[model samples]
Target: TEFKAGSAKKGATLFKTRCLQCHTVEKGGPHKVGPNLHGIFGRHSGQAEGYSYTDANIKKNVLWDENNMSEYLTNPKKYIPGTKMAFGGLKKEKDRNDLITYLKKATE
Candidate 1:
């Protein structure tokens, strides 16, 4: 729940390498394998307009803030069973921090 500040610029770079293929952080960004992340930071899970979601995600009563996302992103399958996300996860804590940092700045 605490760490050094992450670099949003570097987070963008990490997204290009790590998440650009399936997700988009731009405003009104289209859904790919995942939903567009325009206002994802404060969103409820699986509530993105027009996107289909599994029960595991759709039924969640959670918000997408840093702490919640940190746990989910760290181990998606273990955190939310039946999720469609296929990535193993970002192993490096710094990488995860930067990605969330980038997420905070994206579409702002």
Candidate 2:
């Protein structure tokens, strides 16, 4: 499937409102509760700066590919027991897909 920049931008807005409190996307945004997400998609799990990640995530050695990101966003606690993301899962495939698309574009 083709990458949709429009949908991605929409997703970015969604992320800003829903996720920006804890996370950061710009090169040097504040890492309030979570690490900066400068290049999260395709990145290995537990590789962010400063923040200490759980062993579960490290053991997984996961990469944030499309499939992995989709699954993780659907249920982070179920996906990674010790992850610090306090927000509940998005609970919809379209939202997850759109968010991943947005992250892909933004991170690129």
Measured with C-alpha atoms, the lDDT of residue 73 in candidate 2 is: 73
lDDT of 1 at 48: 69
lDDT of 1 by residue, 1-108 (tens): 654468787888878877788887785667888877778777788876678888888787579887677778778888779899888877567667767877777645
lDDT of 1: 0.77
Residue 2 in candidate 2, Cα distance off native in Å? 13
Q: Which residue pairs in candidate 2 collide?
A: none
Please give the RMSD to the true structure for each candidate, in Å. Answer: 1.6, 2.5
Quote model 1's TM-score.
0.88
* Candidate 2 residue spans exceeding 4 A from truth: 1-6
Please, what is the TM-score per model?
Answer: 0.88, 0.85
lDDT of 2 by residue, 61-98 (tens): 77878767767777889988977887887877766667
Candidate 1, residue 1: how far the Cα is off, in Å? 2.6
